[PDB]
Design an enzyme around this catalytic site. Sequence first.
Site, short mmCIF file in Angstrom:
data_model
loop_
_atom_site.label_atom_id
_atom_site.label_comp_id
_atom_site.label_asym_id
_atom_site.label_seq_id
_atom_site.Cartn_x
_atom_site.Cartn_y
_atom_site.Cartn_z
N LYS A 6 0.98 -1.11 -0.20
CA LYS A 6 0.29 -0.24 0.10
C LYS A 6 1.18 1.02 0.18
O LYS A 6 0.43 2.06 -0.48
CB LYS A 6 -0.77 -0.26 1.14
N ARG A 9 1.97 1.53 -3.63
CA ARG A 9 0.85 2.09 -4.36
C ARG A 9 0.83 3.95 -4.58
O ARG A 9 1.06 4.77 -5.09
CB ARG A 9 -0.26 1.61 -4.24
N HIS A 11 2.84 6.43 -2.39
CA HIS A 11 3.79 6.93 -2.33
C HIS A 11 4.94 7.01 -3.31
O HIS A 11 5.77 7.85 -3.79
CB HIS A 11 4.57 7.02 -0.90
N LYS A 40 -8.12 11.71 -1.01
CA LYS A 40 -7.70 11.44 0.49
C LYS A 40 -7.51 13.24 -0.13
O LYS A 40 -6.46 13.84 -1.91
CB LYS A 40 -6.51 11.21 -0.58
N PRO A 41 -7.23 13.71 0.50
CA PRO A 41 -6.69 15.60 1.07
C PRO A 41 -5.36 15.51 0.51
O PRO A 41 -4.77 16.97 -0.36
CB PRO A 41 -6.89 15.99 1.94
N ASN A 43 -1.13 13.43 -0.25
CA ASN A 43 -0.30 12.58 -0.63
C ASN A 43 1.22 13.28 -1.16
O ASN A 43 0.97 13.84 -1.65
CB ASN A 43 -1.15 11.13 -1.76
N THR A 44 1.94 12.67 -0.74
CA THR A 44 3.22 12.32 -1.43
C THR A 44 3.79 12.10 -2.17
O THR A 44 4.05 10.28 -1.47
CB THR A 44 4.39 13.10 -0.25
N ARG A 84 -2.18 18.00 -3.08
CA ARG A 84 -3.08 18.85 -2.44
C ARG A 84 -4.72 19.28 -2.68
O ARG A 84 -4.41 20.08 -3.58
CB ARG A 84 -2.83 20.26 -0.54
N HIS A 118 4.62 4.12 5.95
CA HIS A 118 3.79 4.82 6.42
C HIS A 118 4.25 6.59 5.59
O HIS A 118 5.61 6.35 6.15
CB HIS A 118 3.51 5.67 7.68
N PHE A 119 4.02 7.23 4.96
CA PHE A 119 5.09 8.17 4.52
C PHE A 119 4.27 9.46 6.34
O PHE A 119 3.31 9.70 5.74
CB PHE A 119 4.59 8.96 3.67
N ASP A 120 5.64 10.69 6.81
CA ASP A 120 5.23 10.54 8.14
C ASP A 120 5.83 11.93 7.26
O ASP A 120 4.24 12.78 7.75
CB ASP A 120 6.22 10.50 9.17
#
Length: 123
Positions: A6, A9, A11, A40-41, A43-44, A84, A118-120
């Site tokens: 996930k 896909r 990032h 999704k508000p 995402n990078t 964004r 996760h992308f922090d």
Amino acid sequence: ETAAAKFERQHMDSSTSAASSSNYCNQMMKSRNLTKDRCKPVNTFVHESLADVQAVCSQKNVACKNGQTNCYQSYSTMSITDCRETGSSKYPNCAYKTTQANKHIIVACEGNPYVPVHFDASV
């Protein structure tokens, strides 16, 4: 989907060196299925090889925004694209503002092998 799949896909975009035009986010958020049931508000996308992003899990250990301590900051800057949603955007017509930049990334790692899940943040 496993947690590792996930993250790839949502990032990874190693096929381009950087966001091309202002429509990059509208196109990628849709093709990676991030506009599916909602928009999704934020995402990078990371424009580096998967191996280079996976290596971040062995770099500088820092606290995650949530206080967990399995987060790692890349030693070098990487090419990234921040997507964004605009104040105008509304499901199902999601619209995003694209921002290309070179910054350090911060990811949460887990498992064995220990890879990004996760992308922090980006700094």
